[PDB]
Each structure stands twice: as C-alpha cells, then as structure tokens.
Design a protein around this nucleic acid. Sequence first.
RNA 1: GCCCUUCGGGGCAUUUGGUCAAUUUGAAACGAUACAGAGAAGAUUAGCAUGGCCCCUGCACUAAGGAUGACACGCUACUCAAAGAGACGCUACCAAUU
Length: 154
Amino acid sequence: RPARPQIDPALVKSERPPQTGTVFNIWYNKWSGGDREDKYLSQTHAKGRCNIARDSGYTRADSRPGSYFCLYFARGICPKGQDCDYLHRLPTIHDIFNPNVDCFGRDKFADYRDDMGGVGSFNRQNRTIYVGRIHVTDDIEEIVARHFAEWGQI
RNA sequence: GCCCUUCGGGGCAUUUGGUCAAUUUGAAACGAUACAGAGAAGAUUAGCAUGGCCCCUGCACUAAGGAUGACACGCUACUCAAAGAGACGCUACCAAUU
C-alpha cells in the first residue's frame, strides 16, 4: 500500500512561535525581552500520532536501498505520504544502524543532553527509554504495556 | 531526438545534490525582580602592570577602555637531627600509744 498523508500542509505551514517577548530575534529565531519561567513550564501536547495499520506504508525510501525512517512519520506529523524520502515503518529486528547515526538519520553524540533528551550517545548503547509524567492509577502497567507493545518489541 | 550510412550499421549528448519546507528534547541573550555590594597595613583614592582552562567593547591578533576590567587575600609536618643530663625505667613494697 502507498503511504498515506497523516495531516495536511495547510496546517503544516511554517510560521513563528507565539509571541513571548518584546522583539523577535531573527538570528536565533526566538522571542526576546520576556522571561525565563514561561519557557521552563511550557511543554505542550503533541499535535499528532501515527498508526502502523492505518499510516505505515510504502514510499520512495522503500524504493531506495539504505535510507532512514521518517522522524515526522514517527511523530505523526508527516503530511508527505508516498512522496516522503524516508521510511514510513517501524524498524524490525533486522534494522540495525551504525553508532554514529540513529534510525532517523540524525547524528548521535559523544555525550548526552543534561536532561537526557534528544538523539542519544554512541558512548553508551542505550535501549532504555524513561517515560515520566504519568497519571498514577492502578491500570498504568496495562496501559504502558499496551502502548509500548504497539510501538515495538520489548 | 537529430544526423550519417557501404542499408549491415555507426554517430551526437553522460551520473545533480545544500540532512527534508516541520522551532517542545542537541543547546541565543538581556532586561525586570530579588538580593547584596567598589584596591593599596587610619580616612578618601590617580593609576600602570603581572599570570591564563576569565573574558567583554574595539579594525587594532603590535591602540585604548572595561572598578587600576575582574580573579589574587585560602592553605601551611615530611631531603631533617645531634650532643649530655636525668629516669623505685626493666623489681619489690617492709613489726607499739602506756
């Protein structure tokens, strides 16, 4: 099957972040003249999610050997569909990558970010993710097992 | 596509490239607010330096300035004795008012 579009470019137009400052800095593309606390607490919800059955399909990266997965397909915000140049698929066990890059083609680092976010490190072969800010109920183990079993092999 | 042909064939032209167009998690920085708060053995302070895993402004990486730009002010045995003079040191502990 062809890769379906997940959202549309009418809402994947490119535009500024909302104004949190006196003046927009065009070098760093950030707002200035404001505060620091706002940035710390602001962590919004994701604008999409992807489906293996509904969204994952074939593309020009399935045509081209030795290419990477689509990061925006992983985030569920890939409006490209079949015309994306990166795979719309979960990696299998036969999908291995060199230490210098990750599965999305982004370069890995010698270190970690000090909040352990981002791409990762080739100085540690880490296969363990850390999922915080979970609402504490009793079915949390069932919910985590279901969703991450949907996201891969554990 | 064009050209040539002796109608079999042959020629002309030949491998681009900038990680996607997507801003939370691969790195911008002030200001406001809070707080404190300026060297030289009394008080007040003109400065010029020194050293670099501290830099900023500047064309100056052969000016100048930035509080003399700041930092400096903790800590503190270790190449290490000798002479002569002592030692109930190294063991025991001991029998009359009238």
